[PDB]
Nucleic acid binder design. Structure first.
Ligand SMILES: [Mg+2]
Ligand SMILES: [Mg+2]
Ligand SMILES: [Mg+2]
Ligand SMILES: [Mg+2]
Ligand SMILES: [Mg+2]
Ligand SMILES: [Mg+2]
Ligand SMILES: [Mg+2]
Ligand SMILES: [Mg+2]
Ligand SMILES: [Mg+2]
Ligand SMILES: [Mg+2]
Ligand SMILES: [Mg+2]
Ligand SMILES: [Mg+2]
Ligand SMILES: [Mg+2]
Ligand SMILES: [Mg+2]
Ligand SMILES: [Mg+2]
Ligand SMILES: [Mg+2]
Ligand SMILES: [Mg+2]
Ligand SMILES: [Mg+2]
Ligand SMILES: [Mg+2]
Ligand SMILES: [Mg+2]
Ligand SMILES: [Mg+2]
Ligand SMILES: [Mg+2]
Ligand SMILES: [Mg+2]
Ligand SMILES: [Mg+2]
Ligand SMILES: [Mg+2]
Ligand SMILES: [Mg+2]
Ligand SMILES: [Mg+2]
Ligand SMILES: [Mg+2]
Ligand SMILES: [Mg+2]
Lengths: 138, 131
RNA sequence: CCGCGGUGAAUACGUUCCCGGGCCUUGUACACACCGCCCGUCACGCCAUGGGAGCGGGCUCUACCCGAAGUCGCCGGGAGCCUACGGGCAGGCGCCGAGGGUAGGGCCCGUGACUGGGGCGAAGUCGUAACAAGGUAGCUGUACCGGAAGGUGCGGCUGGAUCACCUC
RNA sequence: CCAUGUGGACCCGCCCCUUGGGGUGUGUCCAAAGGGCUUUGCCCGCUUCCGGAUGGGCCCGCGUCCCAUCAGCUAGUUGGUGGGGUAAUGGCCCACCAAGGCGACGACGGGUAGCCGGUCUGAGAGGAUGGCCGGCCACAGGGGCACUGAGACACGGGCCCCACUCCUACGGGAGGCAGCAGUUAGGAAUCUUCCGCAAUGGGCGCAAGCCUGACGGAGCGACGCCGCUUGGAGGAAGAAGCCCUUCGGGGUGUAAACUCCUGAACCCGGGACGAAACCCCCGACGAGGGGACUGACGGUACCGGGGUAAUAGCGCCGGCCAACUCCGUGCCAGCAGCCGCGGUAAUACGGAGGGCGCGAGCGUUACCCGGAUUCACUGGGCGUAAAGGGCGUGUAGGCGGCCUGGGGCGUCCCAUGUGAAAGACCACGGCUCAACCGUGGGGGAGCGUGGGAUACGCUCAGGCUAGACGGUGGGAGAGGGUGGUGGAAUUCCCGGAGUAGCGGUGAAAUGCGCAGAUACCGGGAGGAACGCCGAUGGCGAAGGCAGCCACCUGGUCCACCCGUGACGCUGAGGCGCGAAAGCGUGGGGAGCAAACCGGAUUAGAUACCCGGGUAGUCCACGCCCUAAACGAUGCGCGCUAGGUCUCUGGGUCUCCUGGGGGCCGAAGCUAAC
């Protein structure tokens, strides 16, 4: 039994990418599905599409990387070099609007969860709201 | 530790331990010398080093090193203790200031002075600049 | 001593042991490096501390009696003052009350005969426990005997070496 | 005291409100003083009542250190009714009734501490602190108490007790500086027994004005901060001196000398802002206008003239930390923040020269923050470095899968009230600058009220099955407990047979043997463990668990998808389990074996070796609870290459899928291993 539904996903994407898999599956759910909507509009992952496996819903996240490199260790740079969880369970981290994070000096987002859908540091600030700081990706 | 641990039974702040048992803070002490012996050094170094017990105003009978090339302290002299430990003398952790009370500054010294209480010289003994 | 030459042997299975050395490997708590280290002991000194018969001082709870000031409550009467007699004042008694005394229990401040071991500090003492299979593998909980070191018992551990016991 | 009553107070009936708010009815109760002048006028005052103003009481949410080696506190204590008391609620006080109230979301106790605006530090988060100024509290010799009053339970008021010094014909009285100033004690340490009432302010008065160490100021202290000076230009390939110099010269150094220019101190003359009204006059006693007195600081600041070159020190110069030679000294004398430096070449001791730093100051000591991501929220850890609780069960608590809908507590947003002043930031301005001060401006977390959102968390309802649990059927196992049987071996006893030695050791000896041992055969008693299988294996939460058999019992894995429907993971405290040893009662006691008895080795052996031997090892019940109780690595869950060997279930079965044990290894990790 999972303890933190999201964190699970984030990680499942994290390791997934470290071994360069083409895409990984993760338990479906509105939220996660809305959380991946961002990683997708933002370029960290080609995309996700509702899929079934054994009979239970899952989400196929098609990871995105870069080009192969020159010299030793030719593996492709990472698109999601880092993807942490901020607001863990039993640690709820909600930030005001003036408390929203800047994240990797604009090189990365920070998915918030404001009472106005799931937005990113940008949007959320643009709309003028704050809320549970779900994660930080770069 | 879990943050819900840090919550119940938080973090213990770091208490300090004064390496200078000179009551009520106080920067200097007034004590009455008692025995002015000559303790030896320690592991690496060697010689004879002037030192002297001091019945402190606060009530403590603490040892004190006697700086300088030579001094005039005896068995009843009143003295001022500063503070600072010597590393070749276990037990003492305080210094004796000079040119203060029965404690007189060493003669002829010429650089230290402020340290080693010792009114500089007169140099040819004229105004602030002649010689 | 340096050198010359004349005559001219014996023996060597074999590397285990003795002295010196080369390579490889393992252990190491050693690295002016085993003509090493470290632990413990007895002796001289210094700093602090635990216990601690007994005493002194202040503070608190408890039981019972003693209880100032003062406010509240009762009286305030042919014997006190005032009274248009409605009543007021003095005074009296009482509950409460500072504090005090009696016996007992705990708290800390302080003095202290008697006692324990501690840490450190020059040069010394005796043993050799540990460190390399450290010459009885080591450690460990426990029990016992020993001034102490440590010795042996019982079970565990490897944080044990050595092609007995076979991960590097 | 009576009268009076716009009115107001109370009871009581009623209305509008809604806990003693407002309005009303008949009844009852309650006022008061005068003084003064330019006296038919007005000033002051006075009484009652409603309102404003200000100030304050009370109450509540929230926030406020350390120690659980402080864990239980509480009897007026928790509530209730009646009553007392107060301006008002109330255990605030008393009487009765009930028995409760507070506590691990730390009560009770000990220790420490006035709290805040702010200050210091810090990148921030945070830490440390709360002296000056401002707001709040509390105290005034210790303790208690009330009187008077709007207000006090009254610092320079009062009463009693205590201590204390003081007067006393001893019968009894008097005081309190934690007010300014001073004294003494303490101490490393903290000032003038000043001037002024001119100003701002407070008190009383129609006013004149009185009072006021509040305050405005001056003095002392480099205690801190800020500005100022000791001079400015010139002045030789370069004085003297002192230093160094494999001795030619380098250095102090343009530094001085010397020249010229300026001219703090000091002298002369002038000297003020801070001061305008209260009073008096006109006016109307308004508004307004006119008049006049009014300084502590001061003869000070400041301006004008003249005017002399006219205080410097202190720390360091091995590395951190910027600054190097020589002479002395010789593990001495001495340095030292850490590391250390000195035992006859010291850049680390002392002096000299030189140099760096800072400059009326510089060093030092103490303490706070920093560095210290060394208590880590931001920002750490636990295989071997300090760190996983011996294991489990489970309480409080923390945490919680999937879908939809209500709430919308959290959470976010907008408005608004609050967030005084000083300080802080910013702009502007004043004192010749600054320090310091004035004006304006900005922001603020939090908290209150109103409105809004609803993703995520909380709550509620409805629904699902991907967690979990159950069911069906199957498997392995030294899992445990109870009872019972089995063989080997050992020692002891009996019989037979049989001798002279056996045993033991590096060698030996003690020890056992002719009451005939050992060695061999047969039979008997007893205790303990249980070969080979057996393993590089298994099972158990750990400890731990192996002859076989039966029985009672735990857990667990798989196949089926059948049932419930999130029912879950963790787990402070509690409770239970927990090798060996040890302890208690009782039994048993073959072998072994602490202590102990001898033997031998040794320089000596209370030791390694040897021969005996007690507790003990054994079982029963009770106790102990520790451990290298080790994988030295908490539990659960999800995710991330493989290969190889192995145990156990399913399988289209030497291939794939589940559970468990080892090996080697991707990525990754690690200080390395
Ligand atoms: Mg002192
Ligand atoms: Mg001098
Ligand atoms: Mg001079
Ligand atoms: Mg040894
Ligand atoms: Mg083996
Ligand atoms: Mg009525
Ligand atoms: Mg009411
Ligand atoms: Mg910091
Ligand atoms: Mg007074
Ligand atoms: Mg006035
Ligand atoms: Mg007046
Ligand atoms: Mg200041
Ligand atoms: Mg001139
Ligand atoms: Mg810190
Ligand atoms: Mg650490
Ligand atoms: Mg949920
Ligand atoms: Mg809400
Ligand atoms: Mg303010
Ligand atoms: Mg439900
Ligand atoms: Mg079974
Ligand atoms: Mg559990
Ligand atoms: Mg036992
Ligand atoms: Mg027993
Ligand atoms: Mg026997
Ligand atoms: Mg460790
Ligand atoms: Mg099958
Ligand atoms: Mg496996
Ligand atoms: Mg490996
Ligand atoms: Mg690798």
């Amino acid at each position: 039994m999972l303890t933190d539904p999201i964190a699970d996903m984030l990680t499942r994407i994290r390791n997934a990418t470290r071994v360069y898999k083409e895409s990984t599956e993760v338990p479906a759910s509105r939220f996660k599905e809305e959380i991946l909507k961002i990683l997708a509009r933002e370029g960290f992952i080609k995309g996700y599409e509702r899929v079934e496996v054994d009979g239970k819903p899952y989400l196929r996240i098609h990871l995105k990387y870069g080009p192969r490199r020159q010299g030793p260790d030719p593996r492709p740079e990472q698109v999601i070099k880092h993807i942490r969880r901020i607001s863990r369970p039993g640690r709820r981290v909600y930030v005001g609007v003036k408390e929203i994070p800047r994240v990797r000096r604009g090189l990365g987002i920070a998915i918030l969860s404001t009472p106005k859908g799931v937005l990113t540091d940008r949007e959320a600030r643009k709309l003028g709201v704050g809320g549970e700081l779900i994660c930080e990706v770069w | 530790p879990t943050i819900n641990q840090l919550v119940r039974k938080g973090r213990e702040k770091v208490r300090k331990k004064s390496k200078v048992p000179a009551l009520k803070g106080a920067p200097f002490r007034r004590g009455v010398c008692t025995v002015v012996r000559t303790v030896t050094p320690k592991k690496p170094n060697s010689a004879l080093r002037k030192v002297a017990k001091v019945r402190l105003t606060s009530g403590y009978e603490v040892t004190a090193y006697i700086p300088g090339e030579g001094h005039n302290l005896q068995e009843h002299s009143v003295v001022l203790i500063r503070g600072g430990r010597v590393k070749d003398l276990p037990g003492v952790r305080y210094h004796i200031v000079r040119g203060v009370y029965d404690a007189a500054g060493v003669k002829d010294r010429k650089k230290s002075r402020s340290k080693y209480g010792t009114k500089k010289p007169k140099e040819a003994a004229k105004t602030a600049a002649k010689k």
